[PDB]
Amino acid sequence: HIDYTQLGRAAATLMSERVFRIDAYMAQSRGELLHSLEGFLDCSLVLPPTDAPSEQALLSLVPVQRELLRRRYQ
Amino acid sequence: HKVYVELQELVMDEKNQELRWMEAARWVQLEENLGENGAWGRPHLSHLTFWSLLELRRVFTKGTVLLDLQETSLAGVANQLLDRFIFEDQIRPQDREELLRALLLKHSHAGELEALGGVKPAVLTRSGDPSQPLLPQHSSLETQLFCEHSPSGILEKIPPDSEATLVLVGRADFLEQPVLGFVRLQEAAELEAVELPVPIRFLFVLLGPEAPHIDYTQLGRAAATLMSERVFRIDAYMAQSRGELLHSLEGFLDCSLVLPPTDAPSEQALLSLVPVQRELLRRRYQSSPAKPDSSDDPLQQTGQLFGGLVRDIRRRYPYYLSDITDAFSPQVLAAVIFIYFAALSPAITFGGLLGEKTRNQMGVSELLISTAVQGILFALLGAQPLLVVGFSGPLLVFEEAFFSFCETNGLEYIVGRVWIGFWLILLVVLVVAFEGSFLVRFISRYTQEIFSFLISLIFIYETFSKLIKIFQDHPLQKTYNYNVLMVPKPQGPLPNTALLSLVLMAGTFFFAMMLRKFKNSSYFPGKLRRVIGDFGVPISILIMVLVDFFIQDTYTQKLSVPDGFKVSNSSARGWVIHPLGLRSEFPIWMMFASALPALLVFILIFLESQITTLIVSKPERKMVKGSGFHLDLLLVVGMGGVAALFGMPWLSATTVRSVTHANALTVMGKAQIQEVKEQRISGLLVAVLVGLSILMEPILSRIPLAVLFGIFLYMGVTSLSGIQLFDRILLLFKPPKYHPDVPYVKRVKTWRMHLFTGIQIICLAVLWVVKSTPASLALPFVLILTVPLRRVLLPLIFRNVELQCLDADDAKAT
Amino acid sequence: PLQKTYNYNVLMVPKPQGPLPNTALLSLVLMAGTFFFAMMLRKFKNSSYFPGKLRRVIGDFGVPISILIMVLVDFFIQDTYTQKLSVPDGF
Numbered sequence: 001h002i003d004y005t006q007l008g009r010a011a012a013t014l015m016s017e018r019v020f021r022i023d024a025y026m027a028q029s030r031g032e033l034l035h036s037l038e039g040f041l042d043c044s045l046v047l048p049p050t051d052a053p054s055e056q057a058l059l060s061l062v063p064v065q066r067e068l069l070r071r072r073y074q
Numbered sequence: 075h076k077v078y079v080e081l082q083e084l085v086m087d088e089k090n091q092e093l094r095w096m097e098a099a100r101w102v103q104l105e106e107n108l109g110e111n112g113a114w115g116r117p118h119l120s121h122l123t124f125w126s127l128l129e130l131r132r133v134f135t136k137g138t139v140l141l142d143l144q145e146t147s148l149a150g151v152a153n154q155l156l157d158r159f160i161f162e163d164q165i166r167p168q169d170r171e172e173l174l175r176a177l178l179l180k181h182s183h184a185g186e187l188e189a190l191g192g193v194k195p196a197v198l199t200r201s202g203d204p205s206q207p208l209l210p211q212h213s214s215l216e217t218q219l220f221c222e223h224s225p226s227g228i229l230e231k232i233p234p235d236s237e238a239t240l241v242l243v244g245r246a247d248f249l250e251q252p253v254l255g256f257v258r259l260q261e262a263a264e265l266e267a268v269e270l271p272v273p274i275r276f277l278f279v280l281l282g283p284e285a286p287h288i289d290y291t292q293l294g295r296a297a298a299t300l301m302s303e304r305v306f307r308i309d310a311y312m313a314q315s316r317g318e319l320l321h322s323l324e325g326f327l328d329c330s331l332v333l334p335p336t337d338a339p340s341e342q343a344l345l346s347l348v349p350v351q352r353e354l355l356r357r358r359y360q361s362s363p364a365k366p367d368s369s370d371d372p373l374q375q376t377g378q379l380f381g382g383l384v385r386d387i388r389r390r391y392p393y394y395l396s397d398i399t400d401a402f403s404p405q406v407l408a409a410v411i412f413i414y415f416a417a418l419s420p421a422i423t424f425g426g427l428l429g430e431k432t433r434n435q436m437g438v439s440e441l442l443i444s445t446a447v448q449g450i451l452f453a454l455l456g457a458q459p460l461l462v463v464g465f466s467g468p469l470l471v472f473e474e475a476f477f478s479f480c481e482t483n484g485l486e487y488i489v490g491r492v493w494i495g496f497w498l499i500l501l502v503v504l505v506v507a508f509e510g511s512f513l514v515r516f517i518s519r520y521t522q523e524i525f526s527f528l529i530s531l532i533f534i535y536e537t538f539s540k541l542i543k544i545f546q547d548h549p550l551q552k553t554y555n556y557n558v559l560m561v562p563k564p565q566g567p568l569p570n571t572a573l574l575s576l577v578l579m580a581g582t583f584f585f586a587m588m589l590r591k592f593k594n595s596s597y598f599p600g601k602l603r604r605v606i607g608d609f610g611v612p613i614s615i616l617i618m619v620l621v622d623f624f625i626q627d628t629y630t631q632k633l634s635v636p637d638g639f640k641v642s643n644s645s646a647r648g649w650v651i652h653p654l655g656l657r658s659e660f661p662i663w664m665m666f667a668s669a670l671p672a673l674l675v676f677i678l679i680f681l682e683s684q685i686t687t688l689i690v691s692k693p694e695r696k697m698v699k700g701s702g703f704h705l706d707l708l709l710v711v712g713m714g715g716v717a718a719l720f721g722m723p724w725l726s727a728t729t730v731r732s733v734t735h736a737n738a739l740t741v742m743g744k745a746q747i748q749e750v751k752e753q754r755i756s757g758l759l760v761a762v763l764v765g766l767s768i769l770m771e772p773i774l775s776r777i778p779l780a781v782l783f784g785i786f787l788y789m790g791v792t793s794l795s796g797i798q799l800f801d802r803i804l805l806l807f808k809p810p811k812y813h814p815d816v817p818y819v820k821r822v823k824t825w826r827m828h829l830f831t832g833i834q835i836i837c838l839a840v841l842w843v844v845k846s847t848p849a850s851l852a853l854p855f856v857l858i859l860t861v862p863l864r865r866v867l868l869p870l871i872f873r874n875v876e877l878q879c880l881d882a883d884d885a886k887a888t
Numbered sequence: 889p890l891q892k893t894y895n896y897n898v899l900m901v902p903k904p905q906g907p908l909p910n911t912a913l914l915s916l917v918l919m920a921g922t923f924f925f926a927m928m929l930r931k932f933k934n935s936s937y938f939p940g941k942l943r944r945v946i947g948d949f950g951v952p953i954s955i956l957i958m959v960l961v962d963f964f965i966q967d968t969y970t971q972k973l974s975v976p977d978g979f
């Protein structure tokens with residue numbers, strides 16, 4: 001269950017957020033980075049394999065993403 | 075193939091402190107939640123959370139599994155699960171007595187929410203009393219977003235014979251770690267917890283204490299989402315131990331697509347994930363024995379005599395009350411008003427033309443009465459009340475040719491038509507007896523699009539020809555005589571007629587287009603805006619009649635109808651025609667040779683009727699109810715024959731008028747066609763009004779002929795929207811960069827569309843030139859010769875995938 | 889204005905004396921056509937129906953194209969009189 005390319009992609013995705021990089025700049029220890037990482041993963045959603053058509057399912061996820069972002073920037 | 079899943083929580087009622095089981099969400103291929111009011115929210119897909127699924131996996135790697143439990147009641151299942159929990163040292167022996175009392179508790183549905191005043195989350199304690207959670211809570215996401223009739227739809231969506239699963243969640247402060255229990259019954263059995271009659275097969279039980287990053291509602295949602303999938307359900311039907319369930323769960327998570335939060339998400343980049351999910355779905359069915367889901371007939375050969383007729387009767391007639399009732403909207407009235415003019419004007423024009431063609435043997439009153447009769451009868455006894463019958467062009471040329479041949483041979487005209495009708499009756503009875511209409515299945519989209527485009531083009535050209543005739547009647551000169559008599563018709567030119575007619579037509583068309591565009595605008599309250607835009611055509615007509623009625627001295631051509639219920643030529647005709655002979659005996663050779671024109675008439679009527687029925691009753695135009703073919707053909711030919719017995723002409727369904735009628739009774743969604751209003755009242759109203767048109771001289775005496783030209787142009791332009799051949803012709807000029815995302819653009823090369831469209835347009839050009847040729851009667855023949863071309867020639871030039879992609883029976887699906 | 893009868897023995901040398909049959913309606917037709925064509929070409933400039941260079945150069949001269957079309961149209965018409973522009977003869 002280890003593909004290092006995907007791990008590097010995940011690390012890049014972490015670094016791609018504004019809030020995570022702000023916290024990393026302001027960080028002084030490892031606990032703060034862990035707290036920022038858990039806060040980042042708290043606002044992520046998983047889409048299970050559903051038999052619905054792709055287009056409607058992909059356009060239906062906009063409001064939940066808006067809710068997650070609105071809770072993220074609070 | 076589908077089950078029912080119910081989420082249950084341990085809650086406390088506000089009135090008096092006690093605990094009970096409350097339903098929280100239901101799953102029938104979709105998730106539905108309930109709010110604080112007690113009303114379920116709108117259907118939506120399920121989106122779980124990372125922590126919930128993570129903890130579900132963690133607790134499921136060591137949770138116990140009970141397979142083939144032989145129990146029917148709740149008490150035995152609870153006792154067995156508690157015994158298995160005790161056996162594996164997961165729960166202490168001193169906790170079972172409290173847990174059994176907690177679990178065996180009353181279950182209340184939504185109907186008892188308002189009776190108790192609402193429910194709140196509760197936490198069981200060691201004593202047994204309800205308590206508030208210690209960790210802080212926040213409002214749930216699904217009930218806050220989606221929650222802010224249905225039970226019947228729930229009742230049909232559940233399959234008649236299927237099983238159900240129930241999932242139970244709850245927090246307990248006297249426990250060490252969360253525990254999961256999964257039990258599968260030997261035989262599906264009813265339970266008192268669920269009021270629905272569906273039997274229960276699987277049972278989940280979830281316990282544990284409070285801990286950060288665990289939300290029990292969300293983990294229950296995750297479990298329900300896992301259970302909802304067909305592949306995992308089949309795996310549960312075939313699982314023998316926990317290892318296969320673990321492997322299935324790992325596979326389910328492996329082919330799941332998780333996306334992280336971003337800063338400014340956009341719908342353009344987000345639509346780049348359309349293939350990826352598909353691929354993951356394919357992987358989910360790469361290792362699955364099943365197959366993915368998202369990737370009776372009106373016509374069928376029957377071994378019994380007259381099977382199609384009774385099939386159509388039984389399929390159609392049970393909708394009679396709904397068809398009668400569905401006509402209470404003003405849109406039906408507006409459509410009736412529109413179709414009234416749209417049907418009277420060609421009727422008047424053709425009646426006049428036939429009047430000067432056959433020396434008034436056939437006139438206007440007879441055909442209008444016949445039109446009313448065959449419209450009312452078809453509206454009362456028809457299967458598809460959206461068709462509009464009327465006279466056509468090939469019928470006119472056939473009548474002219476028949477009259478010319480009879481003049482050459484010296485025979486009568488109104489007498490031979492009786493035997494023509496008799497032979498048509500015999501032929502139609504023979505054809506319906508052998509139900510030989512199944513040949514309509516051989517006609518693909520190709521010829522249908524060709525026919526529709528050529529008919530619309532001919533309509534537009536005829537309108538422009540009439541307008542150019544209006545100019546040619548009164549040219550632009552410097553001097554005009556004012557001492558001219560105009561009682562039959564104005565002799566000599568007039569100063570300001572043609573320009574006024576052109577201005578009136580331009581005003582009609584411009585106002586119609588502006589109202590049509592304003593209908594889809596956002597300039598008013600929805601009800602008032604839709605009502606105002608619904609009457610655009612009558613509004614424009616009324617405005618123009620007021621405007622030109624205000625003008626006094628200038629003359630414009632007006633509508634004319636015959637004065638009364640009189641035969642066209644009373645000198646040599648009567649109300650009843652003697653079949654044996656009026657003035658001369660009818661020769662034996664003539665009746666024995668009258669079979670030949672009947673074949674051509676039947677072929678023409680047959681082809682036009684089925685192609686029109688195919689065009690109007692496409693599945694794409696949200697046509698929910700079926701369309702019959704044989705009974706409608708029987709009706710139209712029967713009324714045509716009976717009218718020919720009385721001397722009135724036979725008619726046929728009109729393509730453009732029926733298409734416009736269908737478009738008028740179309741409700742669109744905010745675009746997408748939401749639905750189509752189906753009813754029979756419009757035909758009755760149109761028939762009654764056209765019959766009563768003789769009684770409305772003062773109204774039709776003030777309507778100019780030039781105003782209806784704009785209406786005709788509007789109909790001709792509007793009836794070209796659904797055609798795909800026109801879209802391909804428009805794409806013949808666009809660069810390949812701006813082409814849409816339809817499959818037949820990406821799958822084949824651009825010059826392949828150009829070659830296909832070029833072959834088709836050559837076919838249309840041949841049809842037009844043979845139409846202009848005096849041997850126009852051979853026009854239908856080449857049309858059926860188009861049938862082999864798609865079946866033989868095209869696979870010799872293109873490939874099977876390309877030919878299936880272009881000449882597709884369905885538009886969206888290819 | 890629009891009447892039923894007009895005198896045809898009218899001098900037209902200094903300026904239009906008396907009513908005339910077909911002047912006002914043809915003038916209105918010309919105006920409506922010019923406005924409609926100008927708007928149609930302005931919209932077609934922003935369309936996607938041609939190569940960008942050709943589309944932009946064609947749309948760039950929309951107003952003169954409409955003007956030339958209409959001057960050809962009324963120049964082809966012979967008998968009716970329409971008001972024209974007049975300028976002083978010299979400095």
Ligand SMILES: *[C@@H]1O[C@H](CO)[C@@H](O)[C@H](O)[C@H]1NC(C)=O
Pocket residue numbers: 433434642643645646
């Ligand atoms: C009616 O028919 C007769 C003989 O065909 C003819 O002489 C007469 O002119 C007709 N009446 C009309 C055309 O009004």
